[PDB]
Design an enzyme around this catalytic site. Structure first.
Site, PDB file in Angstrom:
ATOM      1  N   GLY A   1      -0.167  -3.633  -8.331  1.00  0.00           N
ATOM      2  CA  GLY A   1      -0.245  -3.410  -9.764  1.00  0.00           C
ATOM      3  C   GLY A   1      -0.077  -1.949 -10.147  1.00  0.00           C
TER       4      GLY A   1
ATOM      5  CG  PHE B   1       6.649  -4.868  -5.290  1.00  0.00           C
ATOM      6  CD1 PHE B   1       7.259  -3.699  -5.720  1.00  0.00           C
ATOM      7  CD2 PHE B   1       7.405  -5.803  -4.603  1.00  0.00           C
ATOM      8  CE1 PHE B   1       8.599  -3.463  -5.458  1.00  0.00           C
ATOM      9  CE2 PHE B   1       8.746  -5.574  -4.340  1.00  0.00           C
ATOM     10  CZ  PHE B   1       9.345  -4.403  -4.768  1.00  0.00           C
TER      11      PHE B   1
ATOM     12  CG  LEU C   1       6.219  -2.311   4.351  1.00  0.00           C
ATOM     13  CD1 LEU C   1       5.237  -1.307   4.921  1.00  0.00           C
ATOM     14  CD2 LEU C   1       6.422  -3.469   5.314  1.00  0.00           C
TER      15      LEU C   1
ATOM     16  CG  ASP D   1      -9.830  -3.647  -6.241  1.00  0.00           C
ATOM     17  OD1 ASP D   1     -10.025  -4.659  -6.953  1.00  0.00           O
ATOM     18  OD2 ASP D   1      -8.684  -3.173  -6.037  1.00  0.00           O
TER      19      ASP D   1
ATOM     20  CE  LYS E   1      -6.806  -6.284  -5.527  1.00  0.00           C
ATOM     21  NZ  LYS E   1      -6.011  -6.259  -6.792  1.00  0.00           N
ATOM     22  N   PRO E   2      -8.617 -10.704  -1.927  1.00  0.00           N
ATOM     23  CG  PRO E   2      -8.330 -12.993  -2.296  1.00  0.00           C
ATOM     24  CD  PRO E   2      -8.877 -11.744  -2.937  1.00  0.00           C
TER      25      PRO E   2
ATOM     26  CG  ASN F   1      -7.231  -4.323  -2.187  1.00  0.00           C
ATOM     27  OD1 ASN F   1      -6.019  -4.133  -2.256  1.00  0.00           O
ATOM     28  ND2 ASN F   1      -8.080  -3.833  -3.074  1.00  0.00           N
TER      29      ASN F   1
HETATM   30  N1  LIG Z   1      -0.817  -0.212   5.062  1.00  0.00           N
HETATM   31  C1  LIG Z   1       0.142  -1.219   4.732  1.00  0.00           C
HETATM   32  N2  LIG Z   1       0.938  -1.729   5.670  1.00  0.00           N
HETATM   33  C2  LIG Z   1       1.834  -2.690   5.349  1.00  0.00           C
HETATM   34  N3  LIG Z   1       1.919  -3.140   4.064  1.00  0.00           N
HETATM   35  C3  LIG Z   1       1.122  -2.626   3.121  1.00  0.00           C
HETATM   36  C4  LIG Z   1       0.228  -1.669   3.440  1.00  0.00           C
HETATM   37  N4  LIG Z   1      -0.456  -1.323   2.311  1.00  0.00           N
HETATM   38  C5  LIG Z   1       0.034  -2.093   1.265  1.00  0.00           C
HETATM   39  N5  LIG Z   1       0.985  -2.892   1.742  1.00  0.00           N
HETATM   40  C6  LIG Z   1       1.739  -3.848   0.940  1.00  0.00           C
HETATM   41  O1  LIG Z   1       1.970  -3.292  -0.388  1.00  0.00           O
HETATM   42  C7  LIG Z   1       0.986  -3.944  -1.250  1.00  0.00           C
HETATM   43  C8  LIG Z   1       0.165  -3.237  -2.296  1.00  0.00           C
HETATM   44  O2  LIG Z   1      -0.641  -2.221  -1.787  1.00  0.00           O
HETATM   45  P1  LIG Z   1      -1.832  -1.734  -2.668  1.00  0.00           P
HETATM   46  O3  LIG Z   1      -2.526  -0.533  -1.964  1.00  0.00           O
HETATM   47  O4  LIG Z   1      -2.826  -2.860  -2.777  1.00  0.00           O
HETATM   48  O5  LIG Z   1      -1.178  -1.341  -4.057  1.00  0.00           O
HETATM   49  P2  LIG Z   1      -1.978  -1.254  -5.416  1.00  0.00           P
HETATM   50  O6  LIG Z   1      -1.103  -0.533  -6.486  1.00  0.00           O
HETATM   51  O7  LIG Z   1      -3.240  -0.470  -5.203  1.00  0.00           O
HETATM   52  O8  LIG Z   1      -2.289  -2.702  -5.930  1.00  0.00           O
HETATM   53  P3  LIG Z   1      -3.494  -3.010  -6.894  1.00  0.00           P
HETATM   54  O9  LIG Z   1      -4.645  -3.637  -6.071  1.00  0.00           O
HETATM   55  O10 LIG Z   1      -3.061  -3.963  -7.965  1.00  0.00           O
HETATM   56  S1  LIG Z   1      -4.153  -1.340  -7.807  1.00  0.00           S
HETATM   57  C9  LIG Z   1       0.646  -5.309  -0.649  1.00  0.00           C
HETATM   58  O11 LIG Z   1      -0.428  -6.102  -0.994  1.00  0.00           O
HETATM   59  C10 LIG Z   1       1.400  -5.327   0.661  1.00  0.00           C
HETATM   60  O12 LIG Z   1       2.013  -6.440   1.217  1.00  0.00           O
HETATM   61 MN   LIG Z   2      -5.195   0.074  -5.896  1.00  0.00          MN
END
Ligand SMILES: Nc1ncnc2c1ncn2[C@@H]1O[C@H](COP(=O)(O)OP(=O)(O)OP(O)(O)=S)[C@H](O)[C@H]1O
Ligand SMILES: [Mn+2]
Length: 266
Positions: A12, A10, A8, A129, A131-132, A134
């Site tokens: 960080g 990626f 879906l 956190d 941000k766009p 999230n």
């Molecule tokens: N609940 C969801 N439903 C569909 N797609 C999702 C969902 N959650 C995350 N995604 C997707 O996967 C991503 C990353 O999810 P995050 O939770 O923001 O991962 P992250 O590792 O915490 O990223 P950061 O902010 O760098 S720490 C995207 O921004 C999306 O397109």
């Molecule tokens: Mn995160």
């Protein structure tokens, strides 16, 4: 129990897979910690903490967390989080594929985010956190806030508040700031501060005043300016003290009404 499928998105920190829950027959989003980071304790810990912190939240505008666990893969244990699946897009994506939203749309979306954050703030929770990336918008156009952060120790970065770049205290007003930033970028198509490093952007966040939105992008208005810049005020004391306050003002702007925010002249 979970039949994983497409990627879906990626982050960080993780890879998020669409999956099917075979006991309830529903799609779910499974967040899997990045393989290489699982070995670092700080990250494993972060991942787990965020999980437990987010499960304490139940609001239509906040992505629900359903479960946890750890896959005992051949490499080692990959922790993962099962959550409500949003079929839609983040605001970052929206901005990157469709440009700035119409003022009214921006207002609607940000106002919904305010409700999410306010609910959160009431059950005693700072996001940290905002941000766009999230914030998601669903196919059916529901706003969904996600990836709630966690209180950390003390001794991106493009939407962090001033008191965050300094090591100061952090409360709801910082969600208010960073949200200010989201609204900004979503009105103008740009985050308020840009630069060639995190350091310099951190500098801007705490030192230089943002250009008024109406001055970066056409058909915005001075009233929006008011709201946006009150949200992005340097000292938390001079901002919207609460998410609801900010929302009320946004509502004022959404109708033909003048906001309470101090006025901004060009
Ligand atoms: N609940 C969801 N439903 C569909 N797609 C999702 C969902 N959650 C995350 N995604 C997707 O996967 C991503 C990353 O999810 P995050 O939770 O923001 O991962 P992250 O590792 O915490 O990223 P950061 O902010 O760098 S720490 C995207 O921004 C999306 O397109
Ligand atoms: Mn995160």
């Amino acid at each position: 129990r979970y039949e994983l499928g497409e990627i879906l998105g990626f982050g960080g920190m993780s890879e998020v897979h669409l999956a099917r829950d075979l006991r309830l027959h529903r799609d779910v989003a499974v967040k899997v910690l990045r393989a290489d980071l699982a070995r670092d304790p700080s990250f494993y810990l972060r991942f787990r903490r965020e999980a437990q912190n987010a499960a304490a939240l139940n609001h239509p505008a906040i992505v629900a967390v359903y479960a946890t666990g750890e896959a005992e893969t051949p490499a080692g244990p990959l922790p993962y989080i099962v959550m409500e699946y949003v079929d839609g897009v983040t605001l970052r994506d929206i901005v990157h594929t469709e440009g700035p939203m119409t003022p009214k749309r921006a207002i609607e979306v940000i106002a919904d985010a305010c409700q999410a954050l306010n609910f959160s703030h009431q059950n005693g929770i700072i996001h940290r956190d905002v941000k766009p990336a999230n914030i998601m918008i669903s196919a059916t156009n529901a706003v969904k806030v996600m990836d709630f952060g966690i209180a950390r120790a003390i001794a991106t970065a493009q939407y962090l508040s001033p008191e965050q770049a300094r090591g100061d205290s952090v409360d709801a007003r910082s969600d208010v700031y960073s949200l200010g930033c989201v609204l900004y970028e979503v009105l103008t198509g740009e985050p308020p501060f840009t630069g060639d490093s995190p350091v310099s952007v951190a500098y801007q966040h705490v030192r230089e005043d943002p250009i008024p939105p109406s001055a970066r992008h056409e058909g915005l208005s001075a009233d929006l300016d008011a709201v946006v810049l009150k949200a992005l005020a340097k000292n938390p004391e001079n901002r919207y003290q609460t998410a609801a306050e900010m929302r009320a003002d946004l509502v004022r702007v959404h109708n033909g009404e003048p906001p309470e925010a101090p006025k901004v002249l060009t």
